[PDB]
């Protein structure tokens, strides 16, 4: 945003530096080199700003933007949840075979070469712990949400 | 022999003492197996007449079978011990795993993302 305003070019001819700083409040944000190419100062100046908000506005936009309705009280495609629970594990086997591959070239060339050298082909380590999180969060949520409705509904 | 289902051999040891009297100990030994036979009448048996389980303890025909037969079931009938082998009420419990497992799921979620 950075609201600016003109400075007198007459005072530029005077060689006199304007605006007479009495408070350490304006020299806090550093101007860009691209606006420094332009006449931000030689012809204009920056102003430090903020914003005015209140609890009248904070709650009525916090409590309203991303809000579910009854969505977590469902079963999430009850035939296909367990189908997906194999649709990840099946290639997780072969990725665990890559985890049965990449550990075996350790105690070798130093691992900084194992940092540069692995920029063409995938690692089993990060990709492995990814699907652990995916399969975990896909299961425990549907598990607990399945079991509340037994209590609540009769 | 009291450890396994050796009953008859224990009651053979009731009277076969070479050492001394042991009378007060084989009388406790008598009561503590009296309620044990009186316990193992309570299976899924069929009709037993008034001779077989009448003679499994040590009696011919006193009213001690009236004491056990009115103590527990297997009711005094026409030469009959009645089998109430029901074992029906307790299964089909979804709600108890839906409380205990409802605890253990969140307890799985505690040591899953929150730092300890």
Swiss-Prot record, chain A:
Expression (tissue specificity): Widely expressed. Highest levels in heart and skeletal muscle.
Subunit structure: Component of the 19S proteasome regulatory particle complex. The 26S proteasome consists of a 20S core particle (CP) and two 19S regulatory subunits (RP). The regulatory particle is made of a lid composed of 9 subunits including PSMD4, a base containing 6 ATPases and few additional components. Within the complex, PSMD4 interacts with subunit PSMD7 through their respective MPN domain. Interacts with TXNL1.
Family designation: Belongs to the peptidase M67A family. PSMD14 subfamily.
Biological role stated in the UniProt entry: Component of the 26S proteasome, a multiprotein complex involved in the ATP-dependent degradation of ubiquitinated proteins. This complex plays a key role in the maintenance of protein homeostasis by removing misfolded or damaged proteins, which could impair cellular functions, and by removing proteins whose functions are no longer required. Therefore, the proteasome participates in numerous cellular processes, including cell cycle progression, apoptosis, or DNA damage repair.
Residues recorded as bearing Phosphoserine in the entry: 68
Residues modified as Phosphothreonine: 110
Protein name (record): 26S proteasome non-ATPase regulatory subunit 14
Positions spanned in the full protein: 157 to 310 of 310
Swiss-Prot record, chain B:
Domain of life: Eukaryota
Crosslink feature (Glycyl lysine isopeptide (Lys-Gly) (interchain with G-Cter in SUMO2)) location: 63
Task of the protein: Component of the 26S proteasome, a multiprotein complex involved in the ATP-dependent degradation of ubiquitinated proteins. This complex plays a key role in the maintenance of protein homeostasis by removing misfolded or damaged proteins, which could impair cellular functions, and by removing proteins whose functions are no longer required. Therefore, the proteasome participates in numerous cellular processes, including cell cycle progression, apoptosis, or DNA damage repair.
Similarity field: Belongs to the proteasome subunit S14 family.
SUBUNIT field: Component of the 19S proteasome regulatory particle complex. The 26S proteasome consists of a 20S core particle (CP) and two 19S regulatory subunits (RP). The regulatory particle is made of a lid composed of 9 subunits including PSMD8, a base containing 6 ATPases and few additional components. Interacts with DDI2. Interacts with TASOR.
UniProt name for this protein: 26S proteasome non-ATPase regulatory subunit 8
Organism, as annotated: Homo sapiens (Human)
């Amino acid at each position: 945003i950075d609201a600016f305003r003109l400075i007198n070019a007459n005072m530029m001819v005077l060689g006199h530096e304007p605006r007479q700083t009495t408070s350490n409040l304006g020299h806090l944000n550093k101007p860009s080199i691209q606006a420094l190419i332009h006449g931000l100062n030689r012809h204009y100046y920056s102003i430090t700003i903020n914003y005015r908000k209140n609890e009248l506005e904070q709650k009525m936009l916090l409590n309203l933007h991303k809000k579910s309705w009854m969505e977590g009280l469902t079963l999430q495609d009850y035939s296909e949840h367990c189908k997906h629970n194999e649709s990840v594990v099946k290639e997780m086997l072969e990725l665990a075979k890559n985890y049965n591959k990449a550990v075996e070239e350790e105690d070798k060339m130093t691992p900084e070469q194992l940092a540069i050298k692995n920029v063409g082909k995938q690692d089993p380590k990060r990709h492995l712990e990814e699907h652990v999180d995916v399969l975990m969060t896909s299961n425990i949520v549907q598990c607990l949400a399945a079991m509340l409705d037994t209590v609540v509904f009769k | 022999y009291l450890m396994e289902g050796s009953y008859n051999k224990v009651f053979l040891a009731k009277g076969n003492i070479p050492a001394e009297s042991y009378t007060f100990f084989i009388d406790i030994l008598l009561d503590t197996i009296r309620d044990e036979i009186a316990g193992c009448i309570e299976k899924a048996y069929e009709k037993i007449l008034f001779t077989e389980a009448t003679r499994i303890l040590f009696f011919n025909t006193p009213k001690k079978m009236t004491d056990y037969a009115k103590k527990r079931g297997w009711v005094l009938g026409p030469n009959n011990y009645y089998s109430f082998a029901s074992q029906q009420q307790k299964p089909e419990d979804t709600t108890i795993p839906s409380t205990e497992l409802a605890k253990q799921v969140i307890e799985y979620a505690r040591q899953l993302e929150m730092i300890v």
